[PDB]
């Protein structure tokens, strides 16, 4: 099961700051661009879990496109993994290739492992995000 | 302020920060993230599914953790991996106090050829831990 | 689909749209906008200040209005002015139904030398109007 | 009373869509860039009240910098006016020059009128925003 998301997610400068405040991150590389320059980064760098924004649309959508046998009512987010190959910076264009690595179905409960490879505009990897949904079986 | 690899070494306990978390912080995150699940901001919905009060978002708590790690590392762009399993929930009552996340950390691994250092993390609410295996790694 | 100036002319009543508005829509807007005032999502806070239930944000309601206008004009970039006075509040109960905004409009002015057309607007909840003088203008 | 805001507000592509959904605006010029091209606009155009985002920081701040005699507890937003000189588009850099046009203080109640001129990166006007706060007097 491959799924390539049409269109990219465009990392906003202001949405970065907005998010960092929401998760109580106060590191200057998120708020002032000169500090990002001091750290050695052209634009504002994004908080480590910023992909929860970009990946919101993906996870909602891939459930249907993958036909995962899980009941949304009783589903639970068990595992989150990020391999930051390259830091996410403001004005980054982010493309998503989402794969279904595995499904396990035992008594009552189905455990699904979902991998999204994030690539930039050019097509070089940015972050490898792995999600593990745990839920009540449908079929 | 990315710290040099030579400074930190295995066994180094990390300074504990205690993050307060109000019901307003849960509403803000609902909108910022686009996760509008009522269990995180409506109590009566929380109890129907069988909870005491409304709970913090899973990714809010992990997101906070990123701050706790990124500060110590000194550079967000330095962090190479951030992995967390969610074991429990963080209830946040609309009582004008809310709840507190106590974060802790310990370096468990260094690779001197690399600039890699790995931190084991521990987040708690009222003592109960909310994460299982929760680690972070960064190039120093 | 910017409409031509010749199509519309003074006296043209505008098609009524009825926007539903839930408590979840108020939480989302709180985070999106960064207006985290509890009166818009905590009932017990709403009553302390002397209200029945939590109310919609003022700029949420006007913002909705922009949609109601921008659709008819056909182009957001065409709108030249949007002015509103807030007369009343729009209460949104956490009852699983919420509330409804009934929007209406009427062209009251055209300047054929310009491409300008001016719409008078009327927004209501349960009949009570929430805006006083509320107009919009656009180059067609 | 002049106040010039340091730094600009950078209109995000994704924050535009995010906002348009929040105010139930479904006009395609906010969501798909080709439709914006069809309408005759390079980037995504912003909803009419998008400035509520950018102007959030301003209105919170100018209250103190202007020494308006008003009690925040009992203050009320009475009037909002936008003159869109030029449409706000994605990637616009927005600068704020905020002026205090008038203050009226009568029995119990103070009425304040606050004007923010929004200029772009170059320095040409974008939107003229006028706010009218109504409140309980402090002095």
Would you kindly provide a written description of the structure presented here, covering whatever features stand out?
The complex is a heterotetramer, with 2 copies of chain A (139 residues) and 2 copies of chain B (140 residues). Chain A is of the alpha+beta class. Chain A has one domain: Thiol Ester Dehydrase, Chain A, CATH 3.10.129.10. Chain A has 3 helices and 6 strands. In chain A, strands 1, 2, 3, 4, 5 and 6 form a 6-stranded antiparallel β-sheet that branches. The radius of gyration of chain A is 17 Å and the shape is elongated. The two termini of chain A are 18 Å apart. Helices cover 24% and strands 36% of the residues of chain B. Chain B starts with 12 loop residues before the first strand and ends with a strand. Chains in contact: A-B, A-D, B-C, C-D. Chains A and B meet through helix 1, helix 3 and strand 3 of A and helix 1, helix 3 and strand 2 of B.
List key phrases describing it.
heterotetramer; A: 139 residues; alpha+beta; Thiol Ester Dehydrase, Chain A; six-stranded antiparallel sheet; 3 helices; 24% helix; 41% strand; elongated; B: 140 residues; MaoC-like_dom (chains B, C); (3R)-hydroxyacyl-ACP dehydratase subunit HadB (chains B, C); HotDog_dom_sf (chains B, C); (3R)-hydroxyacyl-[acyl-carrier-protein] dehydratase activity (chains A, D)
The domain tally of chain B reads 1
User: How many beta-strand segments of chain A?
Assistant: 6
Helix percentage of chain A = 10-25%
- Structural class per helix/strand content of chain B? alpha+beta
Shape of chain A: elongated
Computed Rg of chain A? 17 Å
Q: Helix/strand/pairing class of chain A, anyone?
A: alpha+beta
One letter per element, helices H and strands E, the order of chain A comes to EEHHHEEEE
Shape of chain B: elongated
CATH class of chain A: Alpha Beta
Largest sheet of chain A: 6 strands, antiparallel
Give the CATH H-level superfamily of chain B. Answer: Hotdog Thioesterase
Counting H and I runs of at least 4 residues, what is the number of helices of chain B? 3
Report the CATH C-level class of chain B.
Alpha Beta
The helicity of chain B comes to: 10-25%
Topology order of chain B in helix (H) and strand (E) letters: EHHHEEEEE
How much beta of chain A, percentage-wise?
35-45%
| End-to-end C-alpha gap of chain B | 10 Å
As an assembly, this protein is: heterotetramer
Based on the structure given, which CATH architecture of chain B is correct? Roll
């Amino acid at each position: 099961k491959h799924y390539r998301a049409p269109d990219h997610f465009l990392v906003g400068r202001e949405k970065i700051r907005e998010f960092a405040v929401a998760v109580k991150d106060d590191h200057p590389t998120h708020y002032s661009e000169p500090d990002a320059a001091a750290a050695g980064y052209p634009a504002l760098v994004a908080p480590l879990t910023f992909l929860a924004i970009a990946g919101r649309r993906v996870q909602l959508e891939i459930f249907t496109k993958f036909n995962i046998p899980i009941n949304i009512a009783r589903v639970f987010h068990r595992d989150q993994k990020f391999r930051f190959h390259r830091p996410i910076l403001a004005n980054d264009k982010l493309y998503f290739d989402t794969y279904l690595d595995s499904v396990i179905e035992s008594h009552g409960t189905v455990l699904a492992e979902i991998r999204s490879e994030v690539t930039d505009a050019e097509g070089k990897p940015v972050v490898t995000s792995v999600v593990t949904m745990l839920g009540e079986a449908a079929h | 302020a990315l710290r040099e690899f030579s400074s930190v070494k295995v066994g180094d306990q990390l300074p504990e920060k205690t993050y307060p978390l109000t019901r307003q912080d849960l509403v803000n995150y609902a909108g910022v993230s686009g996760d509008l699940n009522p269990i995180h901001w409506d109590d009566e919905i929380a109890k129907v599914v069988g909870l005491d009060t409304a709970i913090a978002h899973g990714m809010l708590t992990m997101g906070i953790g990123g701050g706790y790690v990124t500060s110590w590392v000194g550079d967000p762009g330095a962090v190479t991996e951030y992995n967390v399993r969610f074991t429990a929930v963080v209830p946040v009552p609309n009582d004008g106090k809310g709840a507190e996340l106590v974060f802790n950390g310990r370096v468990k691994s260094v690779d001197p050829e690399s600039k890699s250092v790995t931190i084991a993390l521990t987040a708690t609410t009222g003592g109960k831990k909310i994460f299982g295996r929760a680690i972070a790694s960064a190039k120093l």
